[PDB]
Amino acid sequence: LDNGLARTPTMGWLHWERFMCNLDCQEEPDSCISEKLFMEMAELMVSEGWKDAGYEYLCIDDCWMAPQRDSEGRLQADPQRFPHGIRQLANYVHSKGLKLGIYADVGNKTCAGFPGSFGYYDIDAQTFADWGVDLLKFDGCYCDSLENLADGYKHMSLALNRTGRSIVYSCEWPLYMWPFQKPNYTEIRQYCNHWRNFADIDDSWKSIKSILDWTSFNQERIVDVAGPGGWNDPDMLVIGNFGLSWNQQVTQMALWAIMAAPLFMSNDLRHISPQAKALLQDKDVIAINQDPLGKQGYQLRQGDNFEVWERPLSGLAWAVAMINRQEIGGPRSYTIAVASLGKGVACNPACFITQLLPVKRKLGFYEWTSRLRSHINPTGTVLLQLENTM
Amino acid sequence: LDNGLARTPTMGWLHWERFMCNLDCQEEPDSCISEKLFMEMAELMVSEGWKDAGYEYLCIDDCWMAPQRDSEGRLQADPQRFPHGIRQLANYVHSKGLKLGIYADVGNKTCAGFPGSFGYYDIDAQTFADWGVDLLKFDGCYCDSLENLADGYKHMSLALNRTGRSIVYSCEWPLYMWPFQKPNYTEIRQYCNHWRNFADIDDSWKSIKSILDWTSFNQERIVDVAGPGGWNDPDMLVIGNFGLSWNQQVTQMALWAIMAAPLFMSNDLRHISPQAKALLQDKDVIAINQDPLGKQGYQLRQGDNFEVWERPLSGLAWAVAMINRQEIGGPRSYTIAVASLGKGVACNPACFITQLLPVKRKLGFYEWTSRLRSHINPTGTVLLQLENTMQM
Numbered sequence: 001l002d003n004g005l006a007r008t009p010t011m012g013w014l015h016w017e018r019f020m021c022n023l024d025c026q027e028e029p030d031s032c033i034s035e036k037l038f039m040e041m042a043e044l045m046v047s048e049g050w051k052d053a054g055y056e057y058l059c060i061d062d063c064w065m066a067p068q069r070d071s072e073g074r075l076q077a078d079p080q081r082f083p084h085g086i087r088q089l090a091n092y093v094h095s096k097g098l099k100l101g102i103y104a105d106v107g108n109k110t111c112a113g114f115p116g117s118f119g120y121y122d123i124d125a126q127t128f129a130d131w132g133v134d135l136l137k138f139d140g141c142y143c144d145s146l147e148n149l150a151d152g153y154k155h156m157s158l159a160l161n162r163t164g165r166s167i168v169y170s171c172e173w174p175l176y177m178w179p180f181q182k183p184n185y186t187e188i189r190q191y192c193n194h195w196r197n198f199a200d201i202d203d204s205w206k207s208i209k210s211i212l213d214w215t216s217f218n219q220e221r222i223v224d225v226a227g228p229g230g231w232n233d234p235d236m237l238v239i240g241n242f243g244l245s246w247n248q249q250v251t252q253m254a255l256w257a258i259m260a261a262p263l264f265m266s267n268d269l270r271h272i273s274p275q276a277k278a279l280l281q282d283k284d285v286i287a288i289n290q291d292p293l294g295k296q297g298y299q300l301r302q303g304d305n306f307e308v309w310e311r312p313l314s315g316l317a318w319a320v321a322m323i324n325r326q327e328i329g330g331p332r333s334y335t336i337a338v339a340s341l342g343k344g345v346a347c348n349p350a351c352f353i354t355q356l357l358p359v360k361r362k363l364g365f366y367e368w369t370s371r372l373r374s375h376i377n378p379t380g381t382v383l384l385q386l387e388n389t390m
Numbered sequence: 391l392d393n394g395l396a397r398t399p400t401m402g403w404l405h406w407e408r409f410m411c412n413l414d415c416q417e418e419p420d421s422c423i424s425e426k427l428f429m430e431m432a433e434l435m436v437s438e439g440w441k442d443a444g445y446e447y448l449c450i451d452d453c454w455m456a457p458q459r460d461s462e463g464r465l466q467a468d469p470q471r472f473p474h475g476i477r478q479l480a481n482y483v484h485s486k487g488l489k490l491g492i493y494a495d496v497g498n499k500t501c502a503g504f505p506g507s508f509g510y511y512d513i514d515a516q517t518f519a520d521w522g523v524d525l526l527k528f529d530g531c532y533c534d535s536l537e538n539l540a541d542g543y544k545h546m547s548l549a550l551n552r553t554g555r556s557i558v559y560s561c562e563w564p565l566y567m568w569p570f571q572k573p574n575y576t577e578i579r580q581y582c583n584h585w586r587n588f589a590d591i592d593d594s595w596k597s598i599k600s601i602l603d604w605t606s607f608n609q610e611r612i613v614d615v616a617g618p619g620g621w622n623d624p625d626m627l628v629i630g631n632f633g634l635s636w637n638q639q640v641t642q643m644a645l646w647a648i649m650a651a652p653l654f655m656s657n658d659l660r661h662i663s664p665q666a667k668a669l670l671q672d673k674d675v676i677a678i679n680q681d682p683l684g685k686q687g688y689q690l691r692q693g694d695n696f697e698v699w700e701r702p703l704s705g706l707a708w709a710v711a712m713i714n715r716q717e718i719g720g721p722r723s724y725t726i727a728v729a730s731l732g733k734g735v736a737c738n739p740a741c742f743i744t745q746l747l748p749v750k751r752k753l754g755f756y757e758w759t760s761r762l763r764s765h766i767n768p769t770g771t772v773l774l775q776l777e778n779t780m781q782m
């Protein structure tokens with residue numbers, strides 16, 4: 001989407017995976033979907049170095065709305081859970097130097113069953129702009145036709161543009177189209193800043209694997225379309241929660257960087273391990289994800305339960321990820337000719353190789369003739385940066 | 391098995407999950423199956439508090455054998471990877487105050503393809519005893535005859551007995567019987583100190599779940615056969631490795647305690663986090679596993695992606711484990727009347743409840759009519775100890 005936004009993949013925090021549709025503020029006041037929750041996260045995004053690391057967008061997902069539209073037929077935030085309204089919340093978020101994301105749905109209802117935007121795209125877009133919203137996630141539930149789907153995503157895209165406010169536009173368009181009809185990505189990109197291709201992530205290694213496998217299986221279709229202003233969205237970062245081992249968290253961070261994926265954390269910033277925090281704030285890894293060239297990486301090799309992925313970067317550099325998919329035994333040895341990496345240019349005549357994950361270590365100079373050798377932990381990833389020596 | 395051994399579930403370390411059949415000592419010297427690996431593991435068992443915690447048995451799994459038997463028809467340790475032989479390794483292990491486990495197979499080959507013990511049950515038993523072996527794990531590969539399986543397992547049991555040496559006998563008998571007919575556990579219990587019921591564990595939450603679900607699905611068949619001298623074996627502890635989140639590791643430790651499981655760590659004692667070590671050496675949790683009553687626990691309740699398991703303990707005490715099986719969102723509250731716990735006996739007229747996992751916390755006195763309220767992390771377990779009391 002040519003709106004001057006998402007020139008690098010959007011980075012922020014989104015409530016859905018960790019906090020879901022918790023409306024029980026009586027029994028669970030500290031984790032229900034409320035104005036307070038977003039205030040608390042805003043404060044920590046500043047005080048705990050998240051904004052400094054590039055996480056800029058504080059995003060509301062589903063279950064923020066009142067059950068009905070107001071008298072003027074506009075969306076409204078829940079009167080008890082969001083007693084000050086969205087506009088006021090955006091004022092607060094802005095005063096912290098952050099940006100506010102919100103959520104709506106192309107169909108008749110949101111996925112959790114709250115008011116949909118079908119029939120209201122222009123007023124809903126204007127309402128969002130009026131509130132000072134900076135990002136819209138636009139889900140695809142309760143849409144009865146393939147035609148209504150396309151038209152709705154296009155309509156809303158154009159409606160947000162006419163507001164005059166810069167609003168990042170996140171689309172679930174391809175995901176809800178897929179079962180019926182294969183997406184036209186040139187079309188989607190024309191209308192959307194990023195787009196969800198695959199099923200909702202959850203707090204599990206199974207989930208990470210299936211998303212990786214979905215992406216690599218479909219990489220002929222989706223890799224080349226991605227670029228500044230339009231990204232594939234493999235869903236939220238779930239690092240800092242409950243279901244991933246340390247090595248699996250490293251894999252998600254490493255591969256979301258390879259995939260030039262938007263980085264929306266879904267976690268509890270009030271309760272996060274030092275290790276998870278340092279990985280999520282990893283400067284060198286964020287820098288790969290945020291590479292200004294914006295060329296999405298891809299799976300290069302698969303065999304013997306290893307995967308090799310690579311991504312071209314600015315200034316003749318490359319990122320390389322090596323995953324161990326064998327879920328038994330110990331760290332396994334993997335070797336590859338450096339001449340096989342970066343299409344044969346990364347290390348011609350030579351390259352300097354720095355390992356970034358699981359830990360930062362300079363590996364040294366590698367000749368065109370060289371072989372790269374690593375031990376990779378089960379379900380873990382080794383992430384390397386290669387700098388050509390001119 | 392009435393040999394006076396495994397009166398509580400056996401505790402130790404077994405190489406298989408973490409090291410498998412790595413024969414490449416040239417290119418993978420640190421993880422290949424060698425005598426140096428076992429020597430070094432023995433040293434760390436002592437120096438790092440593992441033996442103190444109760445982990446006594448250093449166990450060799452598959453892939454220690456030379457390709458062929460010697461001129462006397464006896465098994466031999468691989469000469470390149472075990473140049474000093476098993477006898478000298480057993481000596482080294484005993485001199486650290488530990489015991490040595492070894493591995494063989496009922497069939498013509500071990501699962502990895504090395505010499506089987508069929509036709510050699512008595513000499514192999516004697517060989518191990520001469521070598522100073524204290525435990526035998528006996529696998530079921532390359533034996534496609536139900537009769538030979540049963541006969542070989544029974545024979546090896548009696549063969550070990552006749553050596554006069556105390557040897558823990560670990561059987562994969564019920565697992566390799568599954569494809570043919572349901573196992574007779576009275577028969578197995580008579581011949582074995584513990585027995586593997588289900589497929590090999592690996593380093594994954596998926597594998598933990600499948601083992602738990604297999605156990606609870608089959609509980610009416612396996613729970614009551616367990617007791618001092620004979621345990622169900624749900625396979626190795628894989629805490630300290632790579633594939634389990636902290637909460638998932640807590641789940642395994644807790645539930646292996648509920649199940650009165652043998653505790654065989656399969657990990658690298660040279661490279662293990664302080665958190666995984668603290669969990670594996672948790673004295674209160676180990677005490678539940680090692681409870682003298684030796685009554686296996688069971689799944690009490692299941693629904694809404696929750697599981698409640700409990701185990702009766704010595705002196706009218708109970709362990710209760712609450713599992714959250716929902717793999718999305720955050721901690722979920724679960725409430726239960728304490729009257730429903732411990733067959734209504736644990737907290738009559740009252741009980742003192744101490745949380746053991748994920749952290750140790752005293753929860754206080756609970757009257758028989760009162761309710762217990764917890765929050766459980768996705769894929770995590772809350773482990774509680776209930777002490778029957780007349781007070782408050």
Ligand SMILES: *[C@@H]1O[C@H](CO)[C@@H](O[C@@H]2O[C@H](CO)[C@@H](O[C@@H]3O[C@H](CO[C@H]4O[C@H](CO)[C@@H](O)[C@H](O)[C@@H]4O)[C@@H](O)[C@H](O[C@H]4O[C@H](CO)[C@@H](O)[C@H](O)[C@@H]4O)[C@@H]3O)[C@H](O)[C@H]2NC(C)=O)[C@H](O)[C@H]1NC(C)=O
Binds near residue numbers: 161
């Ligand atoms: C509603 O929709 C319209 C149309 O899609 C959007 O308009 C686009 O807005 C973006 C960002 O403002 C424009 O991109 C910028 O254009 C500047 C000049 O462009 C000229 O040259 C191009 C050649 O391709 C012509 O198409 C165009 O007509 C102009 O003659 C550039 O100077 C900008 O450069 C930026 O990037 C460079 C390098 O990366 C940096 O040095 C600078 O910092 C700078 O930011 C940039 O390319 C785009 O041209 C507009 N398209 C059209 C067709 O007009 C609206 O933004 C949108 N409105 C809202 C509110 O969403």
Ligand SMILES: *[C@@H]1O[C@H](CO)[C@@H](O[C@@H]2O[C@H](CO)[C@@H](O[C@@H]3O[C@H](CO[C@H]4O[C@H](CO)[C@@H](O)[C@H](O)[C@@H]4O)[C@@H](O)[C@H](O[C@H]4O[C@H](CO)[C@@H](O)[C@H](O)[C@@H]4O)[C@@H]3O)[C@H](O)[C@H]2NC(C)=O)[C@H](O)[C@H]1NC(C)=O
Binds near residue numbers: 393556
């Ligand atoms: C080869 O196979 C044989 C046959 O199984 C094994 O011999 C058995 O060994 C066990 C364990 O050593 C013996 O069990 C012991 O029995 C003794 C009781 O004998 C009498 O007295 C008691 C009263 O106390 C009566 O109840 C009973 O009916 C008898 O009349 C006890 O002294 C032992 O108890 C102690 O240890 C046990 C743990 O095993 C504790 O629970 C007790 O509290 C106590 O401390 C014990 O129970 C059994 O009798 C033997 N069976 C036979 C048929 O002889 C060999 O051990 C085995 N050889 C090997 C593998 O080395």
Ligand SMILES: *[C@@H]1O[C@H](CO[C@@H]2O[C@@H](C)[C@@H](O)[C@@H](O)[C@@H]2O)[C@@H](O[C@@H]2O[C@H](CO)[C@@H](O)[C@H](O)[C@H]2NC(C)=O)[C@H](O)[C@H]1NC(C)=O
Binds near residue numbers: 106108142143144145
């Ligand atoms: C949103 O819903 C409207 C309203 O009709 C609904 O759908 C019907 C099939 C039935 O379930 C009713 O109870 C609902 O109220 C949809 O508009 C209708 O569309 C159909 C064809 O799709 C058309 O024949 C009718 O003229 C429409 N009805 C009205 C009231 O105008 C609309 O398609 C839905 N939008 C999306 C994106 O799902």
Ligand SMILES: *[C@@H]1O[C@H](CO[C@@H]2O[C@@H](C)[C@@H](O)[C@@H](O)[C@@H]2O)[C@@H](O[C@@H]2O[C@H](CO)[C@@H](O)[C@H](O)[C@H]2NC(C)=O)[C@H](O)[C@H]1NC(C)=O
Binds near residue numbers: 533
């Ligand atoms: C272990 O193997 C022996 C040897 O026989 C082998 O297996 C046969 C099926 C055949 O493929 C031969 O070429 C192999 O050498 C088995 O002992 C035999 O048992 C069969 C009964 O099936 C009997 O007819 C033969 O007389 C036996 N042969 C000998 C050498 O005594 C034995 O069954 C195998 N043991 C186990 C536990 O599976």
Ligand SMILES: *[C@@H]1O[C@H](CO)[C@@H](O[C@@H]2O[C@H](CO)[C@@H](O)[C@H](O)[C@H]2NC(C)=O)[C@H](O)[C@H]1NC(C)=O
Binds near residue numbers: 185186187190
């Ligand atoms: C995929 O969608 C794109 C955009 O809607 C289509 O590209 C347009 O094609 C028409 C002619 O058919 C041209 O007039 C435009 O210049 C194109 N626009 C863009 C953005 O390049 C394309 O036709 C579609 N492809 C398929 C296979 O349906």
Ligand SMILES: *[C@@H]1O[C@H](CO)[C@@H](O)[C@H](O)[C@H]1NC(C)=O
Binds near residue numbers: 576577
């Ligand atoms: C179980 O097997 C043993 C054989 O040792 C036998 O005593 C018993 O009757 C068997 N039980 C059943 C139900 O077959």
Ligand SMILES: *[C@@H]1O[C@H](CO)[C@H](O)[C@H](O)C1(F)F
Binds near residue numbers: 061111
């Ligand atoms: C849409 O459904 C839910 C919201 O109910 C969630 O936002 C998910 O990621 C979705 F697919 F975008």
Ligand SMILES: *[C@@H]1O[C@H](CO)[C@H](O)[C@H](O)C1(F)F
Binds near residue numbers: 451530562
């Ligand atoms: C038998 O197979 C392997 C050895 O190759 C391993 O020991 C496993 O746990 C088994 F099932 F006992």
Ligand SMILES: OC[C@H]1O[C@@H](O)[C@H](O)[C@@H](O)[C@@H]1O
Binds near residue numbers: 610613614690
């Ligand atoms: O489902 C609960 C039941 O499970 C059995 O296996 C156990 O032996 C019983 O004591 C228990 O009441």
